Design a protein. Structure first.
Lengths: 217, 215
């Protein structure tokens, strides 16, 4: 199913989000090239002002585009189960703060790749680093550690993200992930390196996000 | 726990079955030898006329008795967990027809082996091969492909059974099975089963004789 990924592919990403009861929704559009692992997407808050600063969500929004080298082609399963697709479950524990529960399905719908995801936020502290929007509009480089799951016929991944705090400190987000094939699918332990950049279209009135990302294996 | 199976062991089999709402019950009695893998059983419809022809239930009806050769003794998980026993869950998709859901518990109760099973049938078509009693009074030879369940510490098995249709056609039944201990490398079981009837029995009945071996 790599033929699906050669060249350019249109991307639609949608979110239903409930953080401590704050009901909000995000719609994403753009394209990605698996050959060069570039993602160019613009995300839109359809529910106005976001309760949470944008940074927390960037991970919960396609590992199906990551650059796998020629000698590592057989180790990418994000593409293998395509077009049928796979499910992405995550538990995200923000240290000394609240916790996210996420469930995501990644598939082809026509010629477009789609990510429809449900988000629920629980136990976040007021005027805390998250709810108080004390997170800087930025991102660092991170390594995504991937391991096989012969039990649930998929993959688990475990890592720590560094969100820069306005005051100079850093808030950590521990991640735990599970992926499962929905129809029929296909790795030794191997890893993904991500660089992500934020920007804003000055010709945009609503709350928005321009994402450009480089992901390799 | 193979000492439990050397020589003769008495067998009691009970089922609660609900097919499209049609509630029925069957009671089976007989004996089996693991050494020679023979099953001799007589099943009785306590609820009169069965909605479904007997053949569909025969698989749902003790693998424990299967003949494991001496060099394959460690690959029997049916005997291993005995006397404590194991659970058997199955989803049986009859192609172009309805589906069975089965949950079975197999244990020793005293010196007698007992299989108590809950059965639920759904979406079977009226006047279909199943509901219309269009299945013949017979059975063919099948291979039960067994694989380990390191996740649920048991066994899974997947195969296709061929039920002979009165018209000459064949009805396929796809099987998916799960076994778990309550307290092997990939290897396979070959089954031959024969149907017959006691001429001295007024109610709906089936006499089963089965030979199951390992390879």
């Amino acid at each position: 199913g790599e033929e699906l990924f050669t060249g350019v592919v249109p991307i639609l990403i949608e979110l239903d989000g409930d953080v401590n009861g704050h009901k909000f929704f995000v719609r994403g559009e753009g394209e990605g090239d698996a050959t060069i692992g570039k993602l160019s997407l613009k995300f839109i808050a359809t529910t106005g002002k976001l309760p949470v600063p944008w940074p927390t969500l960037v991970t919960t929004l396609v590992q199906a585009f990551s650059r796998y080298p020629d000698h590592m082609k057989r180790h990418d399963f994000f593409k293998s189960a395509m077009p049928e697709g796979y499910v992405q479950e995550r538990t995200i524990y923000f240290k000394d703060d609240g916790t996210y529960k996420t469930r995501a399905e990644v598939k082809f719908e026509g010629d477009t790749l789609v990510n429809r995801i449900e988000l629920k936020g629980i136990d976040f502290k007021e005027d805390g680093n998250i709810l108080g929007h004390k997170l800087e509009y930025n991102f660092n480089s991170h390594k995504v550690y991937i391991t096989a799951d012969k039990c649930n016929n998929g993959i688990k991944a475990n890592f720590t993200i560094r969100h820069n705090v306005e005051d100079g400190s850093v808030q950590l987000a521990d991640h735990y992930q599970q992926n499962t094939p929905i129809g029929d699918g296909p790795p030794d332990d191997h890893y993904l390196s991500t660089q992500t950049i934020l920007s804003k279209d000055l010709n945009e009135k609503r709350d928005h996000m321009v994402l450009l990302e480089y992901v390799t294996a």
